[PDB]
Design a binder for this molecule. Structure first.
Ligand SMILES: C[S@@+](CC[C@H](N)C(=O)[O-])C[C@H]1O[C@@H](n2cnc3c(N)ncnc32)[C@H](O)[C@@H]1O
Ligand SMILES: Nc1ccc(C(F)(F)F)cc1N
Length: 256
């Protein structure tokens, strides 16, 4: 049994109250108050559509993934990663795909900086899409489940689906469950072929063990995974630590 599986069993035993006190203990988060009020009022400039813009921004500002050229955003949802990339000087085009419909978020039209190079398409299940030529491959898909065997399947399916979209490109891919042994096996194989490293984002909640496979980095995957499992187990051992609360991102306005 992996440390992550022990973390998973403990998370599943939590009451709603304990889960709610655990999920943001010691994490980092952006203050969404201003963006939510603006979005409610139909404002189309400055605001990020979701917490995702700040989440991807954390990797980009650390040079872990450097978006350039034609960017593909798989599972774009409302479009947080797509509107963020649209404002980056090296980026020429942003194509976002998302499933939509019941249980899924629809793209939100915005007029933030670089909006004119963005095309978000709903009704697109990536597991049925042929791969396209692109310079940057982004993927934020992976639905949590109380079952880590369900999550193992979902994770391996994402890893296999993204691979042909990967051919010497910049990339940032969510790995929903990186602790299951069969997931580690695939990740090690992918790292030997495409390089990169698994990174834990401080804006991720404690209720998910997600890590992101980014192109610009190196390291031991197993080691990084176990450090996350230890971190998340340690966060059950003490009273809730209020999160670091930061300013949300300003995505500006106008065309590029
Ligand atoms: C975690 S959200 C992405 C949030 C996004 N990065 C942002 O910044 O707003 C993942 C999204 O993937 C979508 N999704 C899940 N499975 C999908 C699939 N098979 N094809 C396309 N989109 C999918 C979900 O509907 C959801 O909107
Ligand atoms: N995104 C989305 C689209 C359509 C529906 C519907 F009302 F038809 F069920 C629900 C959701 N959540």
């Amino acid at each position: 049994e992996t440390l992550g599986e022990k973390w998973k069993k403990k998370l599943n035993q939590l009451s709603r109250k304990e889960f709610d006190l655990y999920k943001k203990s010691g994490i980092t988060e952006v203050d969404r108050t201003e963006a939510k009020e603006g979005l409610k009022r139909g404002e189309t400039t400055h605001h990020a559509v979701s917490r995702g813009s700040a989440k991807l921004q954390w990797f980009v500002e650390r040079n872990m993934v450097i978006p350039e050229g034609r960017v593909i955003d798989l599972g774009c949802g409302r479009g947080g990663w797509s509107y963020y990339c649209a404002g980056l000087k090296k980026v020429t085009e942003v194509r976002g795909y998302t499933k939509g419909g019941p249980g899924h978020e629809e793209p939100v039209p915005m007029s933030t900086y670089g909006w004119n190079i963005v095309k978000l398409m709903s009704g697109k299940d990536v597991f049925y899409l042929p791969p396209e030529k692109c310079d940057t491959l982004l993927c934020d898909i992976g639905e949590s489940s109380p079952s880590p065997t369900v999550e193992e399947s979902r994770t391996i399916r994402v890893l296999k689906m993204v691979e042909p979209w990967l051919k010497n490109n910049q990339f940032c891919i969510k790995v929903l469950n990186p602790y299951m042994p069969t997931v580690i096996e695939h990740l090690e194989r992918l790292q030997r072929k495409h390089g990169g490293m698994l990174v834990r984002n401080p804006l991720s909640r404690n209720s998910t063990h997600e890590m992101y496979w980014i192109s610009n980095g190196t390291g031991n995957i197993v080691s990084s995974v176990n450090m996350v499992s230890r971190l998340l187990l340690n966060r059950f051992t003490m009273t809730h630590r209020r999160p670091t609360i930061e300013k949300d991102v300003d995505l500006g306005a106008g065309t590029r």
